[PDB]
Paper text:
The iron-dependent regulator IdeR is the main transcriptional regulator controlling iron homeostasis genes in Actinobacteria, including species from the Corynebacterium, Mycobacterium and Streptomyces genera, as well as the erythromycin-producing bacterium Saccharopolyspora erythraea. IdeR is an OCS from the DtxR (Diphtheria toxin repressor) family of transcriptional regulators which typically consist of three domains: an N-terminal DNA-binding winged helix-turn-helix (wHTH) motif, followed by a dimerization interface that contains most of the metal-binding residues, and a C-terminal SH3-like domain (21–23). The main function of IdeR is to repress the expression of iron uptake genes when the intracellular iron levels are sufficient. When iron levels are sufficient for iron ions to occupy the IdeR metal-binding sites, the regulator is activated and recognizes a highly conserved 19-bp sequence located in the promoter region of its target genes.
Due to the similarities between both metals, and the constraints of working with Fe2+, we used Co2+ to activate IdeR in all of the subsequent DNA-binding experiments. We then co-crystallized IdeR with a 30-bp double-stranded DNA oligomer containing the consensus sequence TTAGGTTAGSCTAACCTAA (S = G or C, i.e. G in the forward strand and C in the reverse strand). Crystal structures were obtained for the complexes with the physiological activator Fe2+ as well as the mimic Co2+. Both crystallized in space group C2, containing four polypeptide chains forming two dimers and two DNA strands forming a distorted B-type double helix in the asymmetric unit. Each IdeR subunit binds to one of the four CCTAA repeats of the recognition sequence, one dimer interacting with repeats 1 and 3 and the other with repeats 2 and 4. Both metal-binding sites of each IdeR subunit are occupied in both the Fe2+ and Co2+ complexes. No significant differences between the Fe2+-activated and Co2+-activated IdeR-DNA complexes can be discerned, neither globally, nor at the metal-binding sites. The structures of these IdeR dimers are very similar to the DNA-free dimer structure. Notably, only one direct hydrogen bond is formed between the protein and a DNA base, between Gln43 and the first cytosine of each CCTAA repeat, or guanine at the central G-C basepair of the palindrome. Interestingly, in the DNA complex structures we observe a swap of the SH3-like domains of one subunit of each IdeR dimer with a symmetry-related chain.
Numbering used by the authors:
A (entry chain C), F (entry chain B): 2 to 140, 146 to 231
B (entry chain aa): 141 to 230
C (entry chain D), D (entry chain A): 3 to 140
E (entry chain dd): 141 to 231
Write the structure that this text describes.
DNA sequence: CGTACTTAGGTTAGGCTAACCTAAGTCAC
DNA sequence: GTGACTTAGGTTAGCCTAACCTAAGTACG
């Protein structure tokens, strides 16, 4: 699959991992962008050379000031594009991320400002993800939010769906399933209890239930009632 | 293909209208080549060389001579390449 | 810079055919600001892949496949321009430079949604007809 | 170092079969002085390429294709040893280390010339039978 | 496969001959594993553990015990892995 | 197409070009070893990093003392292998170079010394090429030699075949032709006259005649009567 | 004699597989 | 509890195409 811009996608993959509370290693970029170990290390070396990140002693990737600024810029464009596609153009909910994944690379700051006004200063994507770096475009606590997997291991119960991470949005067939049964932002779900890590978590939405994989359940954030 | 071969055969290029002895014409198309120059597109908007508006094409003689046009809000000089890329109905 | 080299070479040849200019490699070099050797090489790579042929008089003729892709990119370009002017309200002069990038990333799924939103437009905001609406199914 | 990783893994498995030892990945690690992960990964590549299979009891079984290649490398090895001892006169102790590299670059054309020169040898200078002489045509 | 399964079924390994109560035997094969150590091969040549020579295999008891061998030009101690990799015909 | 050892072949290709009187550029290595421009520049940068050569301002490749020593080492192994294959093993004349091309990468100095004694201190390959670096292994002006192409352009005439360059030996079907018509070391040929450059030279040997391409004719050295 | 294009020899970005490594796990007699 | 092997995350060497460049030619009308 074509990344359109390699540098921007590497930066945004590091941002995604930080948002999901996962350590940003080159091994993560390899499995997510589906590129070889040698390819990722070489591309990270060019970005380190250009001064957009640094590799720590424990191998974890750290964004520079320029790197973080660029990552936020790309993510802002992504989630503004997703808003436009849902609210105005009316592209189907499951296909919006894929489209926005390409648009984030071609959108100017000029258009971003026009979109902020057209969309009424949106603060979240259609998947509940906060839109960052609005300060440079001329414009909640998030502590109470817990991961579906961590809730299930801790006892389970009822909770309100708040965020679906970028990682989850890549699979349109899954996003079609989540919409069908009703695991969407602003809907209540019942999270069945499990014991230990790497266990498929069961959830019961408004129009039925389904099974989330450990990496999918970890990516969905909720507020327990 | 209305793009390449116009359905309305009466469509003519500004430079061809100028060379043939000018005339009053309705602006219809501004080709992609013209749009690449933003400062020029601003000048075309200001004087009113935009689709839907009538303009006066001044008669010209020879090739590689700037074509003079008069819009609602004044006039401007088009380069031969630019004038070739603007189509009108007389 | 160009986003997609192939699509911009195809659309540049389409532009020259719309302006009634002879589409030569020298014309592409000028308009995309690339060296003669670069254009000759990229055209050869596009000839190899079956997107165009170099005629006996050296004019670039798009193939069936080349024209289909050229129409696809131009259709996306002129629908993007309408959205940017009619809905988003980007300044009339800046629109083309934006749509010039958007034309490379827009799906046919978005195009069909844009056709509904904009009320079946036949032209761009600059009066240029939108081709290949047949191929969308609209 | 090994010159050809695939051929040295195949010949190492053939060696263990000649010694009446169980061909395990742990045995290859010891003899070629490579880490366990390296040997598991390389064996997996050779399994994917259809040169061997890992049995239920984790012993490495050469395929029809793997055995044919192993026989070919060993035949080259032992003919090289005979040439090195009988003709060139390299010291009895250094010969194997030389033939260990020669076994990877010798054509079947040379093998047939060596068979004529050395007078149809059935064994190496260390008494080990020369296999796959049928396959040369001799 | 005379390599893997010898046509001469009388062929036996030095370690197995030792464990069975020694014996005089003709050296036939020295496997590729033995040849990897050049210093060992020098010692085998010196004392006369080479194909086509008679050697005396000293009786041994237990596993992972050095096998004592006597050649025409003296004797040496073979490691179990080495002794396993040398094949002979008894007498 | 397997080089067996990339470094050694790059070093030997530079040596070959120096012997044929051609400027050793990366473009030459790309043509001869059939590798991409980007591949060759990267491999030359690794050899430069390890001090086996340097790239000049006119971009011609210059061997270091260690580089020249290694190059001579490989060529010595090559031409001693060719001698062994012809004189002792009796491999067909046209197939010998291709075999030696692999053997040059796996032969020890120990074996080289044994081969010198077996072959009676050979000074030339079976193709008339001088064997270098024999001083390191414990062991003719040839200014009168001229290139078949340079003879043809200058008038032509009769000459004795002395050297066939490594470049020519890579084509077995050509070497089969040269053998039959008798354009081999120690045989007389009549080089037909041509005008200008880049023109196929005609040659008449003991058992007929054939046509040599400009790069083939430049690679065959002769002594004119 | 300026326009169009070729020849020749580079460059960086962005991909790949093969074949090596260490550190820290699991699994099984 | 040692031996065999897996998991996880790297490494260098040695290949590739696409897509840009300059300098210095040729072919033409
Ligand atoms: Co998204
Ligand atoms: Co993207
Ligand atoms: Co436009
Ligand atoms: Co574009
Ligand atoms: Co051996
Ligand atoms: Co070997
Ligand atoms: Co040669
Ligand atoms: Co070689």
């Amino acid at each position: 699959n074509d990344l359109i811009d390699t540098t921007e996608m590497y930066l945004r993959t590091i941002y995604d991992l930080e948002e999901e509370g996962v350590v940003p290693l080159r091994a993560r970029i390899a499995e997510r962008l589906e590129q070889s170990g040698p390819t990722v290390s070489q591309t990270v070396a060019r970005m380190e050379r250009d001064g957009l990140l640094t590799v720590a002693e424990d191998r974890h990737l750290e964004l520079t000031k320029a790197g973080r600024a660029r990552a936020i810029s790309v993510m802002r464009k992504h989630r503004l594009a997703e808003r436009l596609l849902v609210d105005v153009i009316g592209l189907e909910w499951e296909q919006v991320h894929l489209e926005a994944c390409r648009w984030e690379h071609v959108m100017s700051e000029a258009v971003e400002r026009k979109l902020v006004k057209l969309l009424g200063n949106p603060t979240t994507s259609p998947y509940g993800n906060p839109i960052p770096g609005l300060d440079e475009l001329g414009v909640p606590v998030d502590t109470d939010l817990r991961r579906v997997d961590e809730v299930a291991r801790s006892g389970g119960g009822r909770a309100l769906v708040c965020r679906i991470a970028e990682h989850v949005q890549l699979d349109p067939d899954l996003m079609s399933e989540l919409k069908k049964v009703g695991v969407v932002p602003g809907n209540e779900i019942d999270i069945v209890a499990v014991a230990g890590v790497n266990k498929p978590i069961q959830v019961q939405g408004s129009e039925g239930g389904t099974q989330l994989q450990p990496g999918i359940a970890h990516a969905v954030m909720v507020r327990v009632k | 293909g209305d793009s390449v071969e116009p359905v309305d055969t009466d469509l003519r290029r500004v430079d061809e209208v100028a060379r043939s002895g000018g005339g009053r014409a309705l602006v219809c198309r501004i080709a992609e080549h013209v749009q690449l120059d933003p400062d020029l597109m601003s000048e075309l908007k200001k004087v009113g060389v935009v689709p839907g508006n009538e303009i006066d094409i001044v008669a010209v003689a020879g090739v590689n001579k700037p074509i003079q046009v008069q819009g609602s809000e004044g006039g401007t000089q088009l380069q031969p390449g630019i004038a070739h890329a603007v189509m009108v109905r007389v | 810079d160009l986003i997609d080299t192939t699509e911009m070479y195809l659309r540049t040849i389409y532009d020259l055919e719309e302006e009634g200019v002879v589409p030569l490699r020298a014309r592409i070099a000028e308009r995309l600001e690339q060296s003669g050797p670069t254009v000759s090489q990229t055209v050869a790579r596009m000839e190899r892949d079956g997107l165009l042929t170099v005629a006996e008089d050296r004019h670039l003729e798009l193939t069936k496949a080349g024209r289909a892709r050229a129409i696809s990119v131009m259709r996306k370009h002129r629908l993007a321009e309408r959205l940017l002017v009619d809905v988003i309200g980007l300044e009339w002069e800046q629109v083309h430079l934006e749509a010039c990038r958007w034309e490379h990333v827009m799906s046919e799924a978005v195009e069909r949604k844009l056709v509904k939103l904009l009320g079946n437009p036949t032209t761009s905001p600059y009066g240029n007809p939108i081709p290949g609406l047949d191929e969308l199914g609209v």
